[PDB]
Design a protein around this ligand. Structure first.
Ligand SMILES: OC[C@@H](O)[C@@H](O)[C@H](O)[C@@H](O)CO
Ligand SMILES: OC[C@@H](O)[C@@H](O)[C@H](O)[C@@H](O)CO
Ligand SMILES: OC[C@@H](O)[C@@H](O)[C@H](O)[C@@H](O)CO
Ligand SMILES: OC[C@@H](O)[C@@H](O)[C@H](O)[C@@H](O)CO
Ligand SMILES: [Mn+2]
Ligand SMILES: [Mn+2]
Ligand SMILES: [Mn+2]
Ligand SMILES: [Mn+2]
Lengths: 385, 385, 385, 385
């Protein structure tokens, strides 16, 4: 289970660089240099990294420090062969974003958020990123009178429409991916699920510029089936990027390594990405627990990749198994994939076997044989075949 | 706080007619006649009722019993002046729908579901209904291999496209409203939130035929902010109908009367429907607890209407209050409603006050004054002004 | 992975006998005869069965039908060698229990509940049961004024104290196990977790007669760590019996087969029962999904036992693995098991290395190496060692 | 609705002193001096304050700075007449506590935690505190192999037994209150609910020294009924102190001001504390949102007290209302408070009206009239009587 840079494994700077500050505790780990992380992640088998603006260039940097940071960074990528497939803006840490970036009630703030975002889009394009993610972690409210959601969705649409105008006036090949989250650190966050972010995109002036960046633990914080939401994003053609991690149910966002948390969901997610042939980065947006030293950091980033690769092999052996393929026909998966009425409306309406002479008791009596199927999936995931 | 039939209050037959069967218990109440419920609901001040096919006509009825039921029903509406604004199909109770209706793996089942739905659309139109709701409570799965969600979303789109072809070939004025629910009675239900149902609609052949029917307690079963989801539905123009009830957090669907459950959410929902000017039915989809006799039933349906009308008055007094209007300007709600950059992209880009000379420390220092605002809302809801 | 009747696998009659009625659907399966279930469960390898009164003898039975049912039953146990380790009362289905059994506001109801319970205790003892479970599924409320919880806990204590007086005046060897559940079918259920049921027991007149019956999916409906709650029950000496099943997070109680749901929790539960040497029944309180026919029923009851036995083997190989034992010392599990201050208070107070000369920076710097440990557990569960 | 220092309103230093650092954001507010907070809280009507060791004396302080801090503090209490009813240890912020304090796997850490706690017990007693709270926010785990819960509960019992030995060897009048929390900042926290903390206390050597400190939002993070858990703590005699705040359902701990969150729960909690006659501090453990400046801080701490006092008046008018008292008899609350069988076991057993001649159909038919009751409670909370 050794990754190679063909597995398309990526990591944010902020992930292995998390110092372990939490709502109740001080950092437990020193700040990593981005160049160290690039070299360490390359040795483990990763294929590239991603960044916020403010991961790479310290907030308030001059234009001469700005360039020094970027040049160092760039030398590390050239030295290791790592890519930068995705980049993003920090519109959540600084106190100025305490009411949001693109939806902050103060108009001057919303203009400043767009200017900070456009400056980093130019950087991203310079460093080769194909996808530009937007996670509006500060867009929301703790109380009902603080935010008119209609106005806020006008502002959000306005900001994303300007960014699409900017990208298409520069000639950039870059797409946008909106990342939903239902809460945390706002009481409630706007566009809180994949379905809200898909819907929203269909109102933008150029919807084809925008897809979604769903993260495992964000839909699971709403108690939702992550594989189900990713199947919808795939069905809409809008799975532009994906964040992988683990989460134990509806509580704070834990950001555990990928394969911790809900292990059977992780199996069914891998099964789906691989059989749909998703070809983007497999990006890990996780935090090594603050119990760990830098050894535990690199163990935890390794086990992300390892659990992906074990669950790919188990999903591949599940679908390849003739007994599974027989059970899938027993459960009528083959029939699900056929049109209901490709004969058309009229034929349907004149078809006496569809109503007047349908035997609803004989149909009701047929067993779906799902439990046998699911125990086959269980025996495959567990290697107990 | 007396309703009148101008308040537009409606109730399903199944709501006050719930006999109190639950996963662990037998009915506690005898079956009501639909004509009794119409007469009792009329006396309480309601403006109409809604029905499943199988509420009104017993599953398997001949065509001579079918008509007898409808004629009785119709005489009660003529006698009381109640309307039927909304109608819907039962594609969940019968054992034939145990794997779904429009997404059942068996193709014969999916054809039978569409035929049962079209027969009731003709009825609905006969009885004056404007909105036809679809709650696919059986569309989903308990295990990951049982349902391919891509195929299932093809089937669901196929069924809704046929229904739109049928309605527009009959000349019917009727629209469809999809009602999302995240789980229960399936493990996971397809289109589990308002945002998933909005997104889905944008893929149908005629999207303008379809909106959403959101229900209070369904988004709250995912831990989501119901007023936020309804603001999005309003922003998309797709709030066709609404189900009102209460729910205490993330657990089984309780269907408590409206104003029980999350009382401050109920306040902010009323505030929003009334200030957006939603003009559909205020429909109560609730179950009187099985602790109650028929006296407790009619008390519980009354208290729905009463709590709506109290919370309308409190929301109206909140928005009318000059001190509230001052606080809303203190918190910059007025600025949220202004465009971020109606000056356009270029101007934004050349505006030095938006970046190069933006004072981010002075902006960060400004307080949003949300807590004062929210305590004003609290004092108004509580009558402690 | 073949059970034998030495594995101590048991099943309720109500589990494989669930007809598939749910809040929204009719039965999908015919009623099983208890004698059939005994013979089928014996062939699969089970070691015994459990029952409600009203599983075995139809509510309202004469005393001549009562005995006929029991005699049939008994002949099936003699024919198969199945035991009856546990028995329990139905104080939830009948409408008379709509406000509870032992805590129903009506005093006549609470007297009737105790009389129905004592009659079945005599039966249980006749059929050899060692443990008598009490799940008060109707003890609770949907609204705050309906139940005074202090009075209700007086009534509950009163009922359990009478039952202990009855058992000890008959000379019976039988113990009681209280089964907690946080909600469903009441809004909120009294003693909603293992910790509330442990606490409660410490107020009964004879606490040594009472332990707990925790069920997987009940603590998981509160988002709680089931292995953690069972470790507490073990630490208190009060794990009298255990209900095993699966549950996908905080929602309705699904009762999935054991190993579905939260698979890593299932691993850590098996690890704990086996290394603590729990010696009671491994009882499966689950419902085969209503998608299934009787073939899917027996598949689902088989896969309970199979997943137990796979997860026992994986836990045994985890703890036996020298590299695991090394990692457990790396993470200082060995130190957790040592007293903090067996030197006593005074010595602690005079120990300068415990405060005045404790180097808190060197201690803070030590990594706990938990992630390496947890990936070892992952590789063992997955057979990817 | 003006507090006075007779209302017994208290606040932690850390509450109004929260600088607004969150998992994703920097402080938004400067650090308050404890003496300023004492003077500001006194003007608002509060009756005292509480503290962690490290709120009042900066971690690592000399013994000459230590005393300077305490003397300043003390002068502010003498100047304002504020009390210090409760004090507590910080065993969560420093990196040394990253695996816990009393349950940390490292034995040297667990000795250091006890020494830091005992030093602050002496301080507390000096400043008049009656209650000493222990919130073990770091006692738990993110993964199953990291913590053996049995060993950890031995360590926890050992630490609390030493603290009780210390207090009773010094002659101190001080009691301990354990505060449960189910998660955050650990994956899972040990003793995660009131019921687990009650149970645990019954194993300590001197249980009468220990009660519970429950907090609103902590039980609500498990989806539990906070008034129900406090009724149990009251029934056990172990409600030593209480933390008041608001929380919107199962998610991160929001710490909203008291009366935000679940407003009907807040009503029923006030009803219960007041009618049980709880006489401890009404302590607010809340965080003013980081959207606020210091004006919004003092608004938010004011609205805590105000919403308590409004909900006390509404609960008092509910219980005083003859129509309510009539409804409570209609719903048989009076009967709940009577013994079930004060006639004893034998009489119960010979009572033919309790079984052989009980009419279970007539009892089942009686309505509980809970919905009428609950709408009366609604009309009272809303002032719509
Ligand atoms: O919840 C935090 C969120 O997952 C964050 O890591 C975003 O993904 C990042 O800001 C954009 O990539
Ligand atoms: O959860 C049940 C659901 O709310 C149901 O009542 C639908 O609304 C009805 O089938 C369509 O109107
Ligand atoms: O939630 C249902 C509960 O699990 C029930 O099956 C009990 O365990 C049974 O009544 C007592 O054994
Ligand atoms: O969740 C944080 C917790 O509520 C904390 O504020 C404790 O109450 C304090 O450490 C002891 O008083
Ligand atoms: Mn992410
Ligand atoms: Mn509904
Ligand atoms: Mn059970
Ligand atoms: Mn607290």
């Amino acid at each position: 289970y050794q990754p190679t840079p063909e597995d398309r494994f990526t990591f944010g700077l902020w992930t292995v660089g998390w110092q372990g500050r939490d709502p109740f505790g001080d950092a437990t780990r020193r700040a990593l240099d981005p160049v160290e992380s690039v070299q360490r992640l390359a040795e483990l088998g990763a294929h590239g990294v991603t960044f916020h603006d403010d991961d790479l260039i310290p907030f308030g940097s001059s234009d001469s420090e700005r360039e020094e940071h970027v040049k160092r960074f760039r030398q590390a990528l050239d030295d290791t062969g790592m890519k930068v497939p995705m980049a993003t803006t920090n519109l959540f840490t600084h106190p100025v974003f305490k009411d949001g970036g693109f939806t902050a009630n103060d108009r001057d703030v919303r203009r400043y958020a767009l200017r900070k975002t456009i400056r980093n889009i130019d950087l991203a394009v310079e460093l080769g990123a194909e996808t530009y993610v937007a996670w509006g972690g500060r867009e929301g409210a703790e109380s009902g009178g603080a935010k008119d959601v209609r106005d806020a969705l006008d502002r959000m649409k306005e900001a994303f429409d300007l960014l699409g105008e900017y990208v298409t006036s520069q000639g950039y090949d870059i797409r946008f991916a909106i990342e939903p989250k239902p809460n945390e650190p706002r009481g409630d966050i706007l566009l809180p699920t994949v379905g809200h972010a898909l819907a929203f995109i269909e109102r933008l002036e150029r919807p084809e510029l925008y897809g979604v960046n769903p993260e495992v633990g964000h839909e699971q914080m709403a108690g939702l089936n992550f594989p189900h939401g990713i199947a919808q994003a795939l069905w809409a053609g809008k799975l532009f990027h994906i964040d992988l991690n683990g989460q134990n149910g509806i509580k704070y966002d834990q950001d555990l390594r990928f394969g911790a948390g809900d292990l059977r969901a992780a199996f069914w997610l891998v099964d789906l990405l691989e059989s749909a042939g998703y070809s983007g980065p497999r990006h890990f947006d996780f935090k090594p627990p603050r119990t760990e030293d830098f050894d535990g950091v690199w163990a935890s980033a390794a086990g992300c990749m390892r659990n992906y690769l074990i669950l790919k092999e188990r999903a591949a052996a599940f679908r390849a198994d003739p007994e599974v393929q027989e059970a899938l026909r027993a459960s009528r998966l083959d029939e699900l994939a056929r049109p209901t009425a490709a004969d058309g409306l009229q034929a349907l309406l004149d078809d006496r076997s569809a109503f007047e002479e349908f035997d609803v008791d004989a149909a009701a009596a047929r067993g779906m044989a799902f439990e046998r199927l699911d125990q086959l999936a269980m025996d495959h995931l567990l290697g107990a075949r």
